[PDB]
Design a protein around this ligand. Structure first.
Ligand SMILES: O=c1ccn([C@@H]2O[C@H](COP(=O)(O)OP(=O)(O)O)[C@@H](O)[C@H]2O)c(=O)[nH]1
Ligand SMILES: O=c1ccn([C@@H]2O[C@H](COP(=O)(O)OP(=O)(O)O)[C@@H](O)[C@H]2O)c(=O)[nH]1
Ligand SMILES: OC[C@H]1OC[C@H](O)[C@@H](O)[C@@H]1O
Ligand SMILES: OC[C@H]1OC[C@H](O)[C@@H](O)[C@@H]1O
Ligand SMILES: [Mn+2]
Ligand SMILES: [Mn+2]
Lengths: 263, 263
């Protein structure tokens, strides 16, 4: 229990705000004792900001930070993620002594308040390149020093992937090789692509999942959900449909807890 | 150092024996001072065993160990890997105090004799589920105790993925959470699939790669290579073709170094 520690998320538009809302709802569901904070930029509508105020203890307006790095973003095939540099504002939140940042496309499945036992920078390994941490869930300490060092590095050097993850890994470059206690178990940031890629591991370990992360171009809010049967329409090879359980949980929380505030 | 330490690989047939030949040639190219050993099973042809003896210091004949676990292997979509339990015989090699096991579908790009500074069990994270280690490159200590404990666990419990990686992860279950010194840098076991999945990380870190691992169903020896133009034919969506230079290097070593020994 601590009023000086928070979960922090980010939304730059009304689309990811549906994500932020479901995440915040899920953190209340599993009885967090910490504060809930969302960083929002001007493109979030006034009405949505009001809705965010019903779920989050603080809605904090910040300016968009955009890498403009079309070259590296294309290398990822995620041309829209330049605005993820806006995440660096999470370090300015000095009213808190420790925070957990969580992407707006994450969903909590159990209480995760034990993450506040960890020190900056604690994060889980990225399934793409596991000597990099995934920047969707991380434990950090707000700091005027670190905030400004991060903004400066972003201005001068940018990010190797055009978004927040590259520059955060570059700044926190010791992560792969020092202190194992700063490696969060993969169940605190379980990307649906690891479910597709090594299903045997998911079958043996996935019952312990604490956070699922709907990493990649297609987000839960882009699906067509039917509330009657509790199914989504799916195309092609969709790693989210290996264990569609998590996507359906996202939609059930959205439909019951969030949608009524929206329409 | 020279005499009581080895690199150890495995081949159960003449197909993977081509990979072992390239692997061994590559370890010689980079001037290892350790022994080179290959485990082989009766399906390997007599003529192919003779060729292996011209590259490896010793060819050690072992019995195939097969999980027969079609249900778990099907989850991976690798119905053929039950015979990978044969890898457990690497622990019987008590003529050596320390070994580095390397999958026959690996390729060495620089001297990696510094792996012998590591202690059992040291291995790189698996890109699919990075709280499991990839069993394609690992540092271990031959032991009659450990060998027999592994065979017993295999016989009574089997493997969660029907192959060696599940059982080795279960047996060495502390790897994810203890001693960061047992986490080998991902450059000592670089899956071609990580190049496709987070290409921006490969562009910044990939030049330091020491080992490449052609993990997955399609192996280098399944491609049609043209030696005249130094090209392969390939089909749509092939992670080996993101950075095809590793595949072409495999084929160049095979064509130049191994093909003459098969005469
Ligand atoms: O247009 C955008 C893109 C990203 N985000 C925020 O930045 C995070 C990171 O982007 P995303 O999850 O899409 O990246 P991925 O996890 O798929 O690589 C999101 O979860 C949001 O919190 C946002 O607010 N608006
Ligand atoms: O039919 C087989 C399959 C596997 N292997 C050996 O077991 C290892 C593991 O198999 P593989 O690399 O195909 O698994 P992956 O790395 O693709 O998951 C190979 O590199 C070989 O050394 C073998 O000798 N014969
Ligand atoms: O940097 C690009 C992206 O890399 C992966 C992380 O999940 C995400 O939060 C970040 O925005
Ligand atoms: O267990 C399945 C497979 O996973 C990848 C490992 O490199 C391989 O050796 C093993 O056979
Ligand atoms: Mn995300
Ligand atoms: Mn392999």
């Amino acid at each position: 229990s601590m009023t000086d520690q928070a979960f922090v998320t980010l939304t730059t538009n009304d689309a990811y705000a549906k994500g932020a809302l479901v995440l915040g709802s899920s953190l209340k569901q599993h009885r967090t004792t910490r504060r809930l904070v969302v960083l929002a930029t001007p493109q979030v509508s006034d009405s949505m900001r009001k809705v965010l105020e019903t779920v989050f203890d603080e809605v904090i307006m910040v300016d968009v930070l955009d890498s403009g790095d079309s070259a590296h973003l294309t290398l990822m095939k995620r041309p829209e993620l330049g605005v993820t540099l806006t995440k660096l504002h999470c370090w300015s939140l000095t009213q808190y002594s420790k925070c957990v940042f969580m992407d707006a496309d994450t969903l909590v499945l159990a209480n995760i308040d034990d993450l506040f036992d960890r020190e900056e920078l604690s994060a889980a390994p990225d399934p793409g390149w596991p000597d990099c941490f995934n920047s969707g869930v991380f434990v950090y300490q707000p700091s005027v020093e670190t905030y400004n060092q991060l903004l400066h590095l972003a201005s001068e050097q940018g990010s190797f992937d055009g978004g927040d993850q590259g520059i955060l890994n570059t700044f926190f470059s010791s992560w792969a090789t020092t202190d194992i206690r700063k490696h969060l178990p993969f169940i605190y940031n379980l990307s649906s692509i690891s479910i597709y890629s090594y299903l045997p591991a998911f079958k043996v370990f996935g019952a312990s999942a604490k956070v699922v992360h709907f990493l990649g171009r297609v987000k839960p809010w882009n699906y067509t959900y039917d509330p009657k049967t509790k199914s989504v329409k799916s195309e092609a090879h969709d790693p989210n449909m290996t264990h569609p359980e998590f996507l359906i949980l996202w939609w059930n929380i959205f439909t019951t807890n969030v949608l009524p505030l929206l329409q």
